[PDB]
């Protein structure tokens with residue numbers, strides 16, 4: 001067969017997958033994916049038949065219920081979504097090579113000739129609030145608005161939910177939480193504000209950072225009340241104390257939080273539409289929002305009438321062309337992001353009159369796996385790993401901020417470095433097992449053997465770990481002044497992970513005030529238009545602290561959904 005539908009229709013009718021009238025149920029292909037499930041079973045049942053030792057197309061880290069049509073199209077060959085970051089040995093029937101080619105918002109002007117027709121028609125739906133983006137900010141705003149009594153529509157352009165938020169690892173920063181007190185940590189909203197402003201080089205909008213710190217415990221409480229486990233508190237870079245919350249054992253915060261949020265939207269019957277891209281915010285004659293034009297992948301353009309539109313579309317760190325324009329030193333770097341994190345959401349915000357700020361501040365994550373091409377969480381250092389160069393020596397304070405860690409790693413021989421840790425570090429952070437399963441954490445019972453495996457000076461590496469361990473026992477790092485030395489690397493086996501910097505987060509974005517209201521260049525609110533999440537600028541200044549983005553999207557998503565519901 002040339003395609004999946006063709007293959008099935010040799011022995012089945014069209015209505016085995018389609019509805020009685022044959023029209024597509026919706027842009028999420030709800031009905032249609034139900035029929036795939038009907039015969040092949042759920043994704044977990046399918047996963048039993050496609051097992052590989054360390055990977056499985058149908059059993060991944062993605063949260064929510066991943067539709068089969070995310071990767072299997074019927075009437076045409078389709079792409080494996082995992083190929084956008086990994087290069088697993090897959091044999092999906094009717095596959096084609098991963099290639100992301102999505103028209104920009106500007107390029108969609110060519111659809112003038114279908115957009116006017118959609119805009120001339122009646123709204124397809126009339127609701128109170130449309131949320132754009134199913135990342136942590138978007139679900140948060142959707143839930144919060146719904147909880148406040150607003151009727152919401154939540155759209156996501158991708159086939160899967162979660163954006164970059166589902167990939168988060170190290171934690172969600174928050175101060176003075178019950179979770180911290182349980183672990184004997186002393187912190188305060190004031191110290192979090194201080195660490196943040198300093199980490200952002202005091203560029204951050206003080207009012208936004210005050211919302212960030214002061215709502216942080218409340219956001220942790222709200223997540224936990226919805227079912228989140230944020231009881232593990234770890235250290236991340238540039239933080240005076242451990243304040244990055246994540247599930248028991250050091251599991252990734254991201255997939256968990258998004259799963260909680262998705263479960264919570266589902267419980268509230270939130271109208272969630274996949275493969276639906278927000279294209280244009282619609283304003284009435286007084287310039288207040290009156291809705292949004294969307295482009296449903298399967299059903300075309302249509303508009304939704306609504307009082308408020310909350311843009312929660314995330315950053316543009318996957319868009320290296322846009323990135324390089326603003327920061328030519330990041331040209332050609334690999335990104336840690338999901339494939340649609342390209343800044344189309346910012347273009348929508350700008351076309352609606354929203355002004356942008358701090359766009360030139362683009363954060364590179366210092367430790368992408370060279371081998372796997374994926375982020376390796378900063379919690380690996382925060383839990384006690386060190387960085388060594390090819391010469392087998394330390395070269396930076398591993399818990400300094402991301403801009404300084406990146407530059408120090410890029411200055412080492414070969415422009416990469418190695419995370420080194422033992423089994424005590426590995427056991428304190430279950431996420432590390434994920435790197436081991438990926439094949440990117442080679443191991444050996446001695447550092448001479450580890451270094452010989454990876455091309456690291458073995459006996460210098462041994463001297464390096466012995467010296468670091470005596471600094472840990474002394475209590476002070478006189479070589480690089482790492483302020484927190486939580487463990488000695490001296491338990492069990494040793495592991496090395498080759499790392500180099502990758503493009504990760506865009507701190508700039510649309511200007512919002514403390515109620516998450518989008519502002520124009522004159523600093524005037526655009527009535528009904530809200531922004532929440534990495535799409536906004538001004539929260540993180542020149543350099544975001546690790547763990548501050550999950551804190552940001554919950555706080556600001558939640559706040560935007562409440563403010564939009566009340567605006568009404």
Ligand SMILES: Cc1cc2nc3c(=O)[nH]c(=O)nc-3n(C[C@H](O)[C@@H](O)[C@@H](O)COP(=O)(O)OP(=O)(O)OC[C@H]3O[C@@H](n4cnc5c(N)ncnc54)[C@H](O)[C@@H]3O)c2cc1C
Pocket residue numbers: 132133134135136137138155156157158161162163164165166167168169170171172173253254276277278279312313314315336337338340341344345348375504505532533534535545546547548549550551553
């Ligand atoms: C690999 C990784 C690990 C990280 N770990 C952490 C961590 O541990 N702590 C921390 O603080 N930060 C962390 N960060 C950053 C953090 O994840 C966030 O920046 C991300 O959660 C921002 O959430 P968001 O809701 O703003 O956007 P995202 O989660 O990116 O979600 C936005 C959604 O909008 C959808 N969308 C975009 N444009 C449109 C459009 N026009 N129409 C419709 N839908 C649209 C996008 O496809 C996306 O799904 C990490 C980031 C990454 C990539």
Ligand code: HEM
Pocket residue numbers: 004007008012016017032033035036038039040068069072073074093
């Ligand atoms: C879009 C919806 C569906 C998806 C994504 C899907 C997935 C697939 C794939 C990938 C294959 C293997 C293709 C190949 O070997 O070339 C397959 C085969 C098959 N499918 Fe589907 N399917 C869907 C709908 C259905 C439905 C509705 C039925 C039954 C009415 C069904 C029953 C089968 C059967 C019987 C086979 C052959 C192998 C077997 O005996 O299980 N599928 N399907």
Ligand code: HEM
Pocket residue numbers: 004005006008009012013014015016017018022023024029032069072073074075076298299
């Ligand atoms: C000859 C039998 C079939 C006919 C005439 C038919 C008709 C169509 C049409 C007209 C569309 C596009 C509708 C639009 O764009 O609004 C479509 C899409 C779709 N059909 Fe079918 N269909 C048939 C069989 C199947 C089968 C067997 C499957 C699944 C195994 C299937 C699953 C889907 C899906 C998932 C879509 C959405 C887009 C895509 O994945 O290609 N159809 N079909």
Ligand code: HEM
Pocket residue numbers: 036037040041042043044046049050057058066067068069070071072080081082089090091092093
């Ligand atoms: C319940 C949802 C889905 C159904 C019913 C379905 C159906 C199937 C079937 C029947 C096969 C052939 C495996 C076999 O020989 O038994 C298969 C293979 C495959 N599917 Fe799915 N699929 C689903 C979701 C997905 C998703 C969401 C993705 C990507 C994230 C995906 C990617 C693949 C790949 C890459 C293969 C080849 C497996 C390998 O080479 O290990 N599928 N699918």
Ligand code: HEM
Pocket residue numbers: 054055056057058059060061062081082083084085086167169252336337338339374375376431433434435437438
């Ligand atoms: C359904 C699609 C995917 C599958 C089946 C898959 C598979 C895997 C596997 C097998 C691992 C090693 C640990 C584990 O077993 O979980 C892994 C790790 C990882 N993958 Fe994926 N992957 C998928 C999509 C993606 C995409 C598109 C990205 C980036 C946007 C990504 C980012 C990562 C990262 C950052 C890690 C490191 C460990 C962690 O953070 O948990 N994955 N993935």
Ligand SMILES: O=C(O)/C=C/C(=O)O
Pocket residue numbers: 168169170171365375376377378379545546547548549550
């Ligand atoms: O876990 C990490 O490395 C990323 C943290 C962050 O971006 O805040």
Ligand code: NA
Pocket residue numbers: 315506507508509533534535536537
């Ligand atoms: Na931003």
